[PDB]
Amino acid sequence: QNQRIRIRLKAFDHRLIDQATAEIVETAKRTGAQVRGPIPLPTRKERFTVLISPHVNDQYEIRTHLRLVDIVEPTEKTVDALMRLDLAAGVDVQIS
Amino acid sequence: LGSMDAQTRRRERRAEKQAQWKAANPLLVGVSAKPVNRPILSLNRKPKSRVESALNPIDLTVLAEYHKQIESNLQRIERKNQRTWYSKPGERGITCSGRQKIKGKSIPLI
Amino acid sequence: SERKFFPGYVLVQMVMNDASWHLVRSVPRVMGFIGGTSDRPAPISDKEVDAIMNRLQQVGDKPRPKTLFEPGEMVRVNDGPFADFNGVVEEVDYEKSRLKVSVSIFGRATPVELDFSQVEKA
Amino acid sequence: MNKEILAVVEAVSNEKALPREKIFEALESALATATKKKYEQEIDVRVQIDRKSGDFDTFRRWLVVDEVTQPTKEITLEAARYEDESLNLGDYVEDQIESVTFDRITTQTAKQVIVQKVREAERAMVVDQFREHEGEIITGVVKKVNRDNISLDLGNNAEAVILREDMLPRENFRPGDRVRGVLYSVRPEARGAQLFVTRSKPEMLIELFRIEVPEIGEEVIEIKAAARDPGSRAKIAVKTNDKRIDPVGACVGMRGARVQAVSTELGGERIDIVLWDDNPAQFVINAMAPADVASIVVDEDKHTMDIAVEAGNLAQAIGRNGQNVRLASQLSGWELNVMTVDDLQAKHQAEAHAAIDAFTKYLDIDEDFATVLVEEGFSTLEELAYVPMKELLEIEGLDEPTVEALRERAKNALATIAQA
Amino acid sequence: GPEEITADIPNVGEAALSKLDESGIVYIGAEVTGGDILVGKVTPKGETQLTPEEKLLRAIFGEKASDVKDSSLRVPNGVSGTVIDVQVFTRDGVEKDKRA
Amino acid sequence: TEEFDAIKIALASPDMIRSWSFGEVKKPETINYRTFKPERDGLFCARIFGPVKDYECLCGKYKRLKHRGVICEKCGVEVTQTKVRRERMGHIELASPTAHIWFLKSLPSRIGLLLDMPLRDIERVLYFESYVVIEGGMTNLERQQILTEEQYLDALEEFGDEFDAKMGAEAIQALLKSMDLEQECEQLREELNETNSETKRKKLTKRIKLLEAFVQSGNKPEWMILTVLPVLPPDLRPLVPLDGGRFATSDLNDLYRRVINRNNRLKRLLDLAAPDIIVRNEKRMLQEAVDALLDNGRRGRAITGSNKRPLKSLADMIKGKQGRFRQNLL
RNA sequence: CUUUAACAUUAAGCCCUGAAGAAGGGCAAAAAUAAACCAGCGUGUGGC
Ligand SMILES: [Zn+2]
């Protein structure tokens, strides 16, 4: 069943990704197995510029966090729910 | 700041027409779509969870079993009928003959 | 299916003396030779016999069934939870035998370690 | 007799989860149709077929009633005494066994009754699928890509259809693409397409804002109105209940990072997330978010909302074909007129001159009273006779018979216009 | 569907069915003329059904008869006479009708 | 039509045939008869010729009189009356060009009288036994000189890229339009004014009257060789409804099936770079098959199973005591 | 560091007709083609 399962989890907004993490914990606990994580990462800022006109003579810090989910004993219902769910637009649910 | 529409500059080309005609006249009466013919369907979606649809998708397995049952029963009946109606006679041949003949009629053509 | 390459023609090795003629014509299902003239059939040319022996040399596989695979090709996956889904491979580890395929799910690349038998080369 | 019917039953013998006694009830209802009203007038029949032995029991009965009419089906109180009070007026229970007669037309209509029962069973199965799946976000892999529609297998051997008008005009998918859609329509009785899926209706946008932002589902932000023109422009109205949360600032989100992802779903379609207001004019002022609104004159009796725009802000407010402000009309529910400076000045002078001409022509009055009626704010003749007298008796220089004569002239003018 | 030798023929009167028995065949010795029915044969006529389930029920329950086109052997025009002999030949496999 | 004067006749151009037809037959199978719908792109069809029933798509979509003109897309069939089934031609695009059988074997040989070449030579050119020379140029050989394989091989030794020598129907087709028409007329008129021998003047007056009539018409020497062969509207050669099972075939349908099978096999052999002997044999088979279709009498060969009679070709539907002049039009 | 961050939306044309941002078209560019309901032909024989 490819039992060695790695998940990294990106977070721009912490509330939306905590909601998605609670949904992952729910859809992992309602199928039989037990889930581990997140063990979160500290503040990893980004280097992203804006499209603004230059001055003739915004944002700089993007607080992104990472979360870790390890699965070692899955079921077929667990991976089915991981292949029959829906998510919010713009966030990553990448099962590494 | 684009304003790169053909109909906009064509209306601006005929601005003298809408300047001459709209002297003590209204400008436009254009109705839009109304929310009466739109079901909002927003009574309750809190038990309509995404993970609960993940554990429980829709199902028509019983439909496939029923359709396979209909196909198998019909195939058995039609195989039996095409087995005992187009059989092969043995060592002697067709023991009768068809003899069918069709005559003519007097058919008018109004 | 298995198609005959030439419908209703037989290629035959000969030396063409008249005994060979009446040997072939005394075979119960044989219509006459197809040559430039009667009493002397024309032999087929040499580039054509090289081209007809070359057109039976395409049935040789293994290499490359599954064990030699390139990175950066959008292929499919048929095993695991990613069964029958498309994705772009990132690198090909021939030593570890683990393809790092980013399956394009929800319009998003999801990388996963898979096998050569667990993917479909498309 | 019983061998053919038992062969039909064993032929239609489905699984134990599927109804098999309703098949008995449907075929005996067909027999009761071909035997009760046969062929014109006028008897009664009961028929019951067991499942174990497969032997029909056709009790040809008559309805127990003591009514002075319908003598063709009546049983008096003496057989009710023989029953020892287990039957009353309306039931029919007795035991005259009649053999089941056949015909071409009876077998034909029995076939019709059973195949309509099977179509109603298909309808029941589709409704049983539809109760859990009234409307959801589906995520399916395409089976066939036809020239008019594509189908989706949503697990456990099901199918859903979506045509080209429900999609975006530039969607051309491939086998192996998890596409997402909304079930919106169903026709279980129809043999053809029974599960209609869309991607270009604004209920998809409602579901996107429900999945994306949690507090809308948590009864904090109220989305009431929405409108779209797919790929180009859309508007949606939000309203907070908790004053602690900005509704527009959260539904837009940080840097617009949420709705831009929704713009990923719709392909660049500019979605104006605006604030809902109870006043419709102030709501339309709030609704033109990349635009500016000067003043709105609302006359719902004439079904008009005249919107004044500032100079220079005409092209960004109107846009393409006047559609988005029309979408704002679809966001408001009322007819929002297109906003233009000189055109609305011409329309206001048109309304003023039409009011002056109607007051000086159809009322038979002087100039000063018509000047008062123009300067009050009454541009039509409808608010002069149906208005209460508390606003007309306060007019100085006019006593009661004069204003009664003026109301009589106004009612006569309305009767003249209504009969013109 | 197959064809029947039944006495059930639509669009005809009762009087033309009088010389027939209930099995669908005229009696030995009934003096018939030109035009009357000798042997009543009927054919199925759909035309467009196309249902993969209705045809299962029609082939068993529906008499093998849904809509009927008349194909009865009738007497040719002009000829008359007296029916002196009838023969019935049944394929091995179909049960014999009672007149056979 | 009505109100028409004199009947006009001439040869038929390939572009005239494409102006006639309404589709290209590709499949040699008539009908499936599992269900009795006609097979698409067969000898019978519905998208090619017309509707099977009256005012109905073959798919069975539009069945109402107020939908006339708009075709279906389920079947591609224009909703029209079945009289259209009697009147629309068809065409077949041949793989190889093909000699007409009448103009070869009317016996005054039109090809032979035109090219000043005996008939038996042209016959053993068309049935793939020789070569002709088409503009040999700086060559010992002349134009109308014919060879065998051995003279062709020795010429390939000698003038290996000088002469242009082909064989089969394409070679005759090359010789026909390579010839002018005005120059032959004026040269032979001057030669007849420079001739007193009688039989030479007989043959040359025949040849110049042929050429003058051929130029005063509209047509051309390319058109005696077929490239696109037309087929008859399929109500005019109907398939015989038997009683029990299969349908009885006509003669024309068997001949068209044989021609289309041969044409498809030759087209596939050209698709796979076949050796030269097999494509020569296959072109000879196709030429013989069209000669069997147009007039079965010159090669009395096409006989069917269980009835060893000659099948009725198209020319047998006109002559005799049963063709359309003596039988049905008088 | 003293009591939860966020205003976004930059893309699809040109021209003609038309009371308009009601509607009808062409051109620079392209993935892709259930139902209420009138009614013969080929052999033989024989005859003239
Ligand atoms: Zn069609």
In whole angstroms, give the CA distance from residue D73 to residue D96.
14
A15 to chain D, any CB pair closer than 8 A? The answer is: yes
Task: Write the DSSP assignment of chain C as a string of letters.
Answer: ----SSTT---------HHHHHHHTTSSS-PPP-SSBTTBPPPP-HHHHHHHHHTT------SSSSSS--SS-EEEE-SGGGTTEEEEEEEEETTTTEEEEEEEETTEEEEEEE-STTEE--
Closest nucleotide C1' to the C-alpha of D340: G21
CB F133 within 8 A of CB F164: yes
D321 touches strand G (CB under 7 A): yes
Helix, strand, coil % over all residues of chain B, rounded to 5? 45, 0, 55
Is strand G within 7 Å of residue D297 (CB)?
no
Tell me, letter by letter, the H, E, C secondary structure of D71-84.
CCCCCCHHHHHHHC
D49 lies within 8 A of chain E by CB: no
Q: How far apart are CA F312 and CA C54, in angstroms?
A: 46
E86 Ramachandran zone, left/alpha/beta (phi>0; psi -120 to 50) = beta
Residues 6+ away with beta carbon under 8 Å from E18: none
What method was applied to determine this entry? cryo-EM
Tokens 């695979």 sit at which residue? Answer: C69
CA of F62 relative to ligand 1 center, distance in Å:
8
Say whether the CB atom of D313 is under 7 angstroms from strand G: no
For the CA of D112 and the C1' of G36, the distance in angstroms is 19
Which residues 66-125 of D interface with strand G at a CB distance below 7 A? none
Residue C115, burial from CB neighbour count under 10 angstroms (0-12, 13-18, 19+): middle
Taking CA atoms, D48 is separated from D21, D54, D55, D58, in Å, by 11, 10, 9, 6
| DSSP symbols for D121-158 | HHHHHHHHHHHHTSS-EEEEEEEEE-SSEEEEE-SSS-
Greatest Cα-to-Cα distance within chain F, rounded to the nearest angstrom: 78
Task: Enumerate neighbours of A (3 or more CB pairs within 8 A).
Answer: B, C, D
CA dihedral F159, F161, F165, F167 (to 10 degrees): 120
Residue D420: burial class (beta carbons within 10 Å; 0-12, 13-18, 19+) = exposed
CA angle C10, C14, C20 (to 5 degrees): 100
- Measured in angstroms, what separates residue F76's CA from nucleotide G33's C1'? 12
> For residues F25 and F43, what is the distance between their CA atoms, to the nearest angstrom?
6
DSSP-derived pairing of the beta strands F307-310 and C74-77:
unpaired
E33 Cβ partners below 8 Å, 6+ apart?
A: E75, E80
Kindly determine whether residue B51 and residue A80, on different chains, have CB atoms separated by under 8 Å. Answer: no
Q: Which residues of F touch B (CB under 8 A)?
A: 243-244
CB F290 within 8 A of CB F98: yes
Q: Are D238 and D252 in contact (CB under 8 A)?
A: no
Q: Please, are residues A76 and A1 in contact by the beta-carbon 8 Å criterion?
A: yes
Report the candidate in C38, C49, C37 with the shortest Cα–Cα distance to residue C11.
C49
SS3 content of chain A, % helix, strand, coil (to 5): 25, 15, 60
CATH of domain D130-198: 2.40.50.140
Range of the domain at C67: 61-122
The DSSP-derived string for D31-95 is HHHHHHS-SSS----EEEE-SSS--EEEE--------SS-TTS---HHHHHHHTS---TT-----
* CATH 1.10.150.20 describes domain D344-419: yes
CA neighbours closer than 13 Å in the CB half-sphere of residue E32: 24
Cis peptide bond upstream of C63, omega within 30: yes
D188 preceded by a cis bond (ω within 30 of 0): no
When divided into structural domains, chain A yields a total of: 1
The CA distance from F255 to F28, in Å, is 10
- Bridge pairing between strands C119-120 and C74-77: antiparallel
Using CB atoms within 10 A of its CB, is residue D252 exposed (0-12), middle (13-18) or buried (19+)?
A: buried
Helix (H, G, I), strand (E, B) or coil at E20: strand
Which residues of chain A neighbour D254 with C-beta distances below 8 Å?
Answer: 12-13
Q: Is residue E18 part of a domain?
A: yes
The whole-angstrom separation of Cα D177 and Cα C85 is 8
Residues of D in contact with B69 (CB under 8 A): 14
CATH classification at residue E34: 2.40.50.150
D178 touches chain C (CB under 8 A): yes
Measured distance CA(F25)–CA(F40) in Å, rounded: 9
In sign, the C-alpha dihedral spanning D402, D407, D412, D417 is positive
Q: Is the peptide bond before D39 cis (omega within 30 degrees of 0)?
A: yes
Q: Are strands D221-229 and C119-120 parallel, antiparallel or unpaired?
A: unpaired
Contact F89, F231 (CB under 8 A): yes
Answer yes or no: is E61 within a domain.
Answer: yes
Strands (E) in chain E, as ranges, are: 37-39, 42-44, 68-70, 73-74
Does residue E19 lie within any of the structural domains? Answer: yes
D102 to D106, E13, E22: CA distances (angstroms): 6, 20, 14
Measuring alpha carbon to C1', the residue closest to nucleotide G7 is D249
For residue A61, the domain's CATH number is 3.30.70.600
In a domain, residue E100? The reply is no
Count Cβ neighbours within 10 Å for each residue of F96-132 and write b for 16 or more, e otherwise.
Answer: bbbbbbebbbeeebbbbbbbebeeebbbebbbbbbbb
What gap in Å lies between CA C61 and CA C49, rounded to an integer?
Answer: 24
Burial of F190 (0-12, 13-18, 19+ CB in 10 A): exposed
Task: Using CA atoms of F71, F72, F78, F82 in order, give the dihedral in degrees to the nearest 10.
Answer: -150
For F36, the token pair is 């009795």
* Helix or strand run (H / E) with residue D3: helix D2-11
Q: How far is the CA of B49 from the C1' of G2 (A)?
A: 39
The region that residue A90 occupies, defined by phi over 0 for left and psi between -120 and 50 for alpha, beta otherwise, is: left
CA F261 to chain centroid: 15
Number of domains chain E contains? 1
Q: What pairs with residue D141 in β-bridges?
A: D153, D178
Rounded Cα distance, B97 and D309, in Å? 95
Structural domain including A58 reads 1-96
- The DSSP letter of residue D339 is P
Q: CB E65: neighbour CB atoms within 10 A?
A: 20
Angle at D374 between CA D418 and CA D304, to 5 degrees: 60
What resolution in angstrom units was achieved for this structure? 3.7
Among residues B58, E41, C104, B78, which one has the least CA distance to residue D153?
A: B58
- Specify the 3-state DSSP secondary structure of F165: strand
**Bases of strand G lying below 7 A from some protein CB:** 4-23, 25, 31-34, 40-43
The CA–CA distances, whole Å, from D396 to B2, D181, D365, D392, D400 equal 56, 67, 16, 9, 11
CA D31 to chain centre: 40
- Chains near B (3 or more Cβ pairs under 8 Å): A, D, E, F
E66 assigned to some structural domain:
yes
Give dist(CA F296, CA F292) in Å, integer. 5
Question: Searching chain C, which residue's CA lies closest to the CA of residue A79?
Answer: C81
